[PDB]
């Protein structure tokens, strides 16, 4: 569901993603997602406009906007958070990536 | 470069992609891309708004908008075409995917 945050069931670079596909856009068996990376190590100067900072599980995370990818529904795990309250910064970051 | 079409150097689901990242958005070593699939078999009723039909190498191709992904520059092959003349339908398809 748009702006809900889930765990990957499968091993990869990242452990969380935010679903960014519209809820009225039907892709049977897949969703378009932006992975989240722990900010803990991630460099502070990195653009917050292109890479928003979000708060999940009492820690800071970077939205890895430029690692956006489709995930099959088979690998979508537990829903862990909702980022709909960050819709503005998510929209701004995606629109910057394509249209600057 | 935004809206240029390239071959993948590596085997995968698709053989071509269109670069859709802004030219003023710097992701060292990667670009955001939408793969192209031969329309030849692809079903005619499929939304042309979400999945535009483009013409390359004297054949029709479907822009697989919902398979958008980052590709490392190491796997970017020859530039084969330019789709900047389809910027309007590409923009419309991406904006529909996220914002309907
Ligand atoms: Cl991480
Ligand atoms: Cl937040
Ligand atoms: Cl194909
Ligand atoms: Cl065309």
Numbering used by the authors:
A (entry chain A), B (entry chain A): 1 to 100
Quote the study that presented this structure, word for word.
The structures of S12G, V46L and S60E consist of a single chain in the asymmetric unit, with two chloride ions. Subsequently, another putative global suppressor S12G was identified by analyzing saturation suppressor libraries using FACS coupled to deep sequencing. S12, located beside R10 and E11 on the exposed loop, is involved in hydrogen bonding with the cognate antitoxin CcdA. The suppressor S12G alone is 0.8 kcal/mol more stable than the WT, and the double mutants are apparently 2.5–5.0 kcal/mol more stable than the inactive mutants. The suppressors E11R and S12G refold at faster rates compared to the WT. S12G shows a much slower rate of unfolding. A cluster of water molecules at a hydrogen bonding distance from G12 stabilizes the loop and anchors it via interactions with the backbone atoms of neighbouring residues reducing the average B-factor in this region. These two water molecules substitute for the hydroxyl group of both the conformers of serine in the WT structure. The CcdB positions 10, 12 and 46 are involved in CcdA binding and mutations at these positions as well as the nearby E11 residue will affect CcdA interaction and conformation of the CcdA interacting loop from residues 8 to 15 (8YKRESRYR15).
The primary experimental system utilised is a 101-residue homo-dimeric protein, CcdB (Controller of Cell Death protein B), which is a part of the toxin-antitoxin (CcdB-CcdA) module involved in the maintenance of F-plasmid in Escherichia coli. To understand the structural basis of stabilization, crystal structures of three CcdB suppressor mutants, namely, S12G, V46L and S60E, were solved. The structures of the S12G, V46L and S60E mutants of CcdB were solved to resolutions of 1.63 Å, 1.35 Å and 1.93 Å respectively. On similar lines, in this study, the crystal structures of CcdB mutants reveal that the suppressors S12G, V46L and S60E possess novel hydrogen-bonds with water molecules or adjacent residues, that were absent in the wild type protein and are likely responsible for stabilisation of the native state of the protein by these suppressors.
